Design a protein around this ligand. Structure first.
Ligand SMILES: Nc1ncnc2c1ncn2[C@@H]1O[C@H](COP(=O)(O)OP(=O)(O)OP(O)(O)=S)[C@@H](O)[C@H]1O
Ligand SMILES: Nc1ncnc2c1ncn2[C@@H]1O[C@H](COP(=O)(O)OP(=O)(O)OP(O)(O)=S)[C@@H](O)[C@H]1O
Ligand SMILES: [Mg+2]
Ligand SMILES: [Mg+2]
Lengths: 442, 442
DNA sequence: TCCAGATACACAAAAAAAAAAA
């Protein structure tokens, strides 16, 4: 059988070395003298490496002269073969890939050789017992695997990591940026715990029906759009853009939502609406997608298109993740939810922007004495919680207990945070404006 | 009869990608792997997609070594075909102009394949009737259309949404309608707290057996048909049309239902019935369907036919949504109910008409000291409570406590309203006339 | 693999009773 090898890869490596000299540093750290297969190729590579290490400039003429000095010019095919190799070079940009291919082929060939060597033993014990045969397998495989080393995926001593951490904390002494390092939510208490909405993270807001989930997410997105510079993308798979716009106008302009919807407004309400209209038309930092049944690929494509068009994004909202469709798994729901969650996390990591994805809760919450949500109430949510960087629930006590002393107030439960504290935050809820607010009072 | 294809477009796309890899972002959004016709081109495009999706450089050597690793370089024609493909492409100036050609050719080929398949199925009925063949053809054509119905959809900015919202608000403001902008329900407090039954919404009425769901729904439908000009469509999956007609006659004529059903009637009752018949024949805005076991597609088709024949509809009634069935999801009841609710919501959104979906309640209510229904008591109802826009419960206290001070009275609880307040409304219930009415006392 | 409906045993226990404390 033909051993695995790529002569074209070796020719490309030689051509790239001849044509380009500034990239020798990267090539020198990936290939050796014994990695090449063809003997004339080995001689040519040895000569080129010797010339390059000698410090002399590399060119076809000097390479031919050096080969003639050792009388190996005719052995490697002559000057014509070298000229053909130089002419057949595709480009010098991808010499690293060629070197990696050559190294991989050498590794697999040596592994096959070691396998044949161990296989030969056993057909001729030569006095060795089973224990000796077992022992002289691990040593050979470890020898053939030790040549490759992870870079830099290796254990590190405390000195380097401690020095890097000291450097990090020394530069962070200046410019505190008032605590928040990501996207300002607008609520001081939640800013203290979450330290803003960090990028490359997945944030999940979940609650029972009619709790204030879409309102909370829209408030966060509106504050981000008002403060930040890059646009904020919203995927409204539940409601049309008209209703979201009416809610935003009611929230910003301090105008009753019902009067806006029914068209019963006085002069002051119109003045407030005109002011917020002027502000919104001056900003131009909001995008709404009202399409239904979007697949993860479509969401990714549209997000990438917007990001490339405007150079970046600030925040992405999905409402909600259970309404997305994966046609390849229409016969299974749990796997579909897992794929949706993994795709959302991958998109968040790729675009380096936070993604606020909403979710629903199971009906087991209301069949218990205590109605406070937990992490198990999310529907089909092994993956929903496994790959979530922050889970925030919404709980209003006045819904279940009409006589509760916490009327006109809501609690945000941080059920999970990888690098932050957890707890509860109390916020004032004003439904007629579709707005949350800081708790000025007790 | 050669199926449509264009090898030149595929070769141009592959050559443009090989020459410059920086335009893969635009190309990946237009042409996929399966759009190609020739199998070697499909394999080479799979290899190109695999190489470029990870960001690694793509060239002749990389693609050739990737194809050779899986014994697939012989099928595509070897390195010679790849070299010819790379050489034959002058430049990638209009690379985006060939992906559309490939996509449209693939779409035409799929359409003609489906057209041949339907004819072949028609030539071999295999025991299927013509109705089944027509249904299959319609389903396949709809599935084809849904994939590429339009391309103008996408993330829109805030300017167009603001302009449309301002136009709608001004239109509503300039035409006062006594505070109700939707279909009047006939009850003053309910209209005040609901502003009518707004269009493009899903409304659910739920109560325990023998509480008044059908009576309340029929009262709403009668009032809507009496005031509106467009007709009202009623789906009666439970009771025959004769019983509903008798109940409606009793409600409108103010005549005992038992006397009408049995036949012992006086002269004043006959006079009132004659007046009601005259009014009904004068208006004639009612359509009653009494078929059982209807799939969502059948009700959608009937509603479309009625709306097309009469140029619009004002109200659609389903009683009740647990009687509808999807034959493809018989093995799971929860998914079937979710599909029914989703289909009802989609129909309401499409036709721009309020839809009343009567629902039952679970038996977990009877185990509580408080018999007032909650949103979680609906049967098999994740989507029922997560998709509705207005939930109205019916609760009569005299059924549980015979000597209540609220005898001859009923309470309606608005358990959920996405864009409105929640509360309760007290109404007078007259069983012998099978109708609700306004309440004047405290 | 989750969601939803329903019969039955067991945990006390929960309050209420209530005895009785006052
Ligand atoms: N004018 C108003 N006055 C008082 N409460 C209101 C008013 N308008 C809306 N609300 C309430 O505000 C809340 C809004 O709920 P949302 O957060 O928008 O919906 P949701 O939480 O996403 O739940 P879904 O999507 O319907 S399952 C509801 O509880 C409404 O009853
Ligand atoms: N002549 C009458 N006198 C007194 N009560 C009456 C009379 N006729 C009807 N009723 C009551 O009015 C109710 C009518 O409500 P219905 O519409 O039958 O309830 P329902 O929701 O349809 O029950 P379902 O369909 O089985 S879930 C009856 O169940 C009786 O309780
Ligand atoms: Mg919502
Ligand atoms: Mg009924």
């Amino acid at each position: 059988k033909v051993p695995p090898h790529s002569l074209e890869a070796e020719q490309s490596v030689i051509g790239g070395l001849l044509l380009d000299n500034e990239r020798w540093d990267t090539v020198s750290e990936h290939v050796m003298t014994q990695d090449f297969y063809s003997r004339p190729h080995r001689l040519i590579f040895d000569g080129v490496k010797s010339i390059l290490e000698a410090g002399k400039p590399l060119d076809l003429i000097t390479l031919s002269e050096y080969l003639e000095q050792r009388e190996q010019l005719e052995d490697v095919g002559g000057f014509a073969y070298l000229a053909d190799l130089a002419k057949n070079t595709p480009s010098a940009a991808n010499i690293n890939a060629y070197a990696e291919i050559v190294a991989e082929r050498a590794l697999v060939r040596n592994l096959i050789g070691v396998a044949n060597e161990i296989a030969d033993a056993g057909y001729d014990p030569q006095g060795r017992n089973a224990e000796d045969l077992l022992d002289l397998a691990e040593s050979k495989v470890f020898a053939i695997a030790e040549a490759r080393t992870s870079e830099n995926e290796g254990p590190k001593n405390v000195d380097s990591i401690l020095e890097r951490t000291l450097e990090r904390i020394e530069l962070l002494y200046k410019t505190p940026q008032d605590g928040v390092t990501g996207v300002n939510t607008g609520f001081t208490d939640l800013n203290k715990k979450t330290a803003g909405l960090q990028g490359s993270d997945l944030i999940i807001v979940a609650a029972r029906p009619s709790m204030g989930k879409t309102t909370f997410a829209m408030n966060l997105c509106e504050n981000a759009a008002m403060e930040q510079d890059k646009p904020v993308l919203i995927f409204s798979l539940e409601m049309p853009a008209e209703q979201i716009m009416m809610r935003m106008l009611a929230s910003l302009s301090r105008v009753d939502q019902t009067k806006i919807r029914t068209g019963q407004l006085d002069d002051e309400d119109w003045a407030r609406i005109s002011s917020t209209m002027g502000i919104l038309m001056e900003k131009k930092n909001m995008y709404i997608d009202d399409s239904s049944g979007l697949t993860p690929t479509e969401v990714r494509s549209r997000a990438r298109r917007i990001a490339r068009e405007h150079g970046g994004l600030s925040l992405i909202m999905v409402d909600y993740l259970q309404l997305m469709r994966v046609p390849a798994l229409t016969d299974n729901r749990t796997l579909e939810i897992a794929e949706i969650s993994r795709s959302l996390k991958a998109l968040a990591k790729e675009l380096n922007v936070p993604v606020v994805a909403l979710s629903q809760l199971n009906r087991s919450l209301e069949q218990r004495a205590d109605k406070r949500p937990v992490n198990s109430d999310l529907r089909e949510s092994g993956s929903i919680e496994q790959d979530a960087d922050l889970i925030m629930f919404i709980y209003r006590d006045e819904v279940y207990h009409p006589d509760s002393p916490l009327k006109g107030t809501a609690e945000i439960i941080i059920g999970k945070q990888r690098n932050g504290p957890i707890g509860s935050v109390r916020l004032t809820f004003q439904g007629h404006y579709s707005r949350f607010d800081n708790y000025a009072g007790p």
